[PDB]
Point group: D3
């Protein structure tokens, strides 16, 4: 299932995201297991906080933290866990956590998939309230898990996101 999904049709700008956690879903963290082909319950979020947007990853990538590149996907309705969406980048949230330096990409679907998000051209177009909610979420969601912490550094743009994707694809292939 998940192991054979291509990273993208035209990398780094046209990529695929496998959704693990739908926007506003009950506060349970799922992770795709490529060895099993199934979603695995990773943990119940200690704070009970919910992801404000859909969350997943780009298959066939390997980031600096040893996991695939993570992506937040903004949509008008939450997406199905375990589904795949063709996406494009808006920017990224830069942070550091227990696993090391971490970044989360921010994306929306391909314009033909989601005409509703077509006017979001970069992270600057995302409403301030939603960016603030995403930052707050990452700063606070691990507050009740011992030995885990998150410091948010700031936002970066589409170019930074593309570098993350290209690096991830290359790292995966050895």
């Amino acid at each position: 299932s998940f192991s054979n999904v291509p990273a993208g049709k035209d990398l780094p700008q046209d990529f695929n995201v496998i959704i693990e956690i739908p926007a506003q879903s009950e506060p349970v963290k799922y992770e795709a297991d490529k060895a099993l082909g199934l979603l695995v319950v990773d943990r119940f979020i200690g704070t009970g906080m919910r992801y404000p947007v859909n969350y997943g990853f780009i298959p066939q990538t390997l980031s600096g933290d040893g996991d695939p590149v993570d992506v937040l996907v903004i949509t008008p309705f939450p997406l199905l866990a375990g589904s795949v969406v063709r996406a494009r980048a808006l920017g990224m949230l830069k942070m550091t956590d227990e696993s090391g330096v971490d970044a989360k990409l921010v994306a929306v679907p391909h314009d033909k998939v989601c005409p509703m998000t077509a006017n979001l051209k970069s992270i600057d177009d995302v409403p301030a309230y939603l960016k603030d909610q995403i930052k707050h979420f990452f700063e606070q969601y691990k507050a009740l898990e011992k030995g885990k912490w998150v410091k948010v550094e700031g936002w970066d743009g589409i170019d930074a996101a593309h570098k993350e994707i290209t690096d991830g694809v290359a790292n995966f292939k050895k």
Copy 2:
């Protein structure tokens, strides 16, 4: 996953349907990808209209439009996206669209799976309001997608549905 699901236990009357879109689900069109083994987000429905009944397809079939035979499955509660249900035909909705002549089968589960639908013996037994809602849905759901259109021609019965299934199974096998 989806690629190895048989078309049916006793074709054309006893067939399997892989569900893509649950009844009354939020207006997001998913499509099963047999190359990936996963549901893919095809598009956000422009009108925001929801499928009034469950929607999916019969695996190992190839219809005249180049896709597997499509099926609407009537149930008392919506079915899980990506699940498989053993079904029987009631009839079909005949239409034409941008891909060419299209028909949608109407089905219910096997009587042992869903005793609640056992007294629905043909499309004539389906309540008029629900048939009207299904027709309205197909006539209007693509109203905000440029270059797409649908003209509904009428309803046909179980014999027509069985022909669609037998043709689809044969076309698939070459």
Copy 3:
């Protein structure tokens, strides 16, 4: 998908459960098909009663009734159908039904997965109201399916559950 999920990381006490039916889900019984890699609609529950806790099975097991060992998993929020959760046993509900002697294990997730259930150390710690609801459910849910019946015998503890798991793993391997 389901066919290659290990029975557990450290059997019988540290095992995996594939979820078929989320707690409080609409009253539709799904079963994982290892030949298809998908959930199949088994039946609409005649009484319309819902599982009061999540329900699934341990893969790579074969119980006395010819199916894998069944497990009820208690969680603060319902789990996704088709997901896998790392679990530990609290005890089991002993019963007899049309397939013969049947037992249902009662489990919670691994403490690192679900800190919320960490203080549930055995079936005696589960609230009386919930145990009573589970017993009532199994006694009554098949009341409107001809030729099916269930007599609940009583609860047993963690040792009994571990025997069921070890027996199931051995039976599966021949």
Copy 4:
């Protein structure tokens, strides 16, 4: 609020029902308090069983058990708790419980309110599965509440329902 809602526009055949418990709602029994003008939590259903159809009462009535006449209202989608629906009778379920002889009317909305239920002309038109689910519900829902019990006697028709309504209206007015 509830105290001034008329029993009906043309009694006993054209009556109003104040909804207390929506179909398939979480298993919490609400009761309208005419002294407060609000819904009050009466009890959490011990068995966790849900009302299979909407449940409420006809205001300005007093039945033999000291409460207003109770009504089950069948609809395609659940109704809002505390809302009022114009309804017509299909029949009634006769039973006895701890409060004494009790009957529950079965109704659908006025045909102009709900065209979907217009072809339900009496209790004989209601699907057997749904009647069986309603009977099962009343026989079992109080199974875990000490000192409470229910014996279902059978179904009766529209004439019996009209007698219940006329008697209730008269009893209320002294």
Copy 5:
């Protein structure tokens, strides 16, 4: 309840809306009855189409069609039926229907109530996709109700909305 809610704190620009139908709610049309103080089920929408945004009215107003001024309220999450929200106008949708000339105001909450909508300053700021969905909804939702019809004429701005409100308040007071 509803009869004593003021039309607004500072009319016509700062007004109150009583919500009848939450955004994306199941397709049941409720109407507030000021004589009863309760929501009444008006009808099940024949097409099964859902309001794409919250819908209600300004109390203590009387429009040209004999009902209070109607308002669509855009929010990030649907609002409770029967709740009251402090709102401001963005514009209005002009149409004609069976009751005569009708207009629907478009509004968002007061900026202190909903900071998320604060950057919506007029109807021109509302995304095109959402305006198109609202127009489509009103053009099509009555398609299966005999003798009812709707022709959409176009959008107008904040000044037109304010005129509707001032006229409505004056008409109500005699």
Copy 6:
């Protein structure tokens, strides 16, 4: 509606709570308006965080902050907004905020209303994870509202809660 609900049947230990915000509801803060008899949208929570348990107030009370005594009510399923529940105290969360010293009572329903919570005899019986989630919620939910802040001081017991209730009832009556 709300203005005539008694503070309790036997104060301070047997009191009534009017629910404003159901557990896990979408992050919209409603407040009961006794002048209107309706729930009013107070604000959309800036952080998007949800109340982890039901939230409301005791009518006919006036606390030190100028509002009625606030109460968190723990239940197995969320309660309806605007409903009334007969409750008993477990303790209280002591804090300070922009309005001054504030305390939130913690309660469960009367044992006959909710047998499921009958073994919760004080705040010490509430699971640690849930107490931690409640504390986290109050510390963080106002993080994105300018000029608002919350410092949590600690938990207190049933005696402290009873003092809050008795003081509130007395303050209300002049």
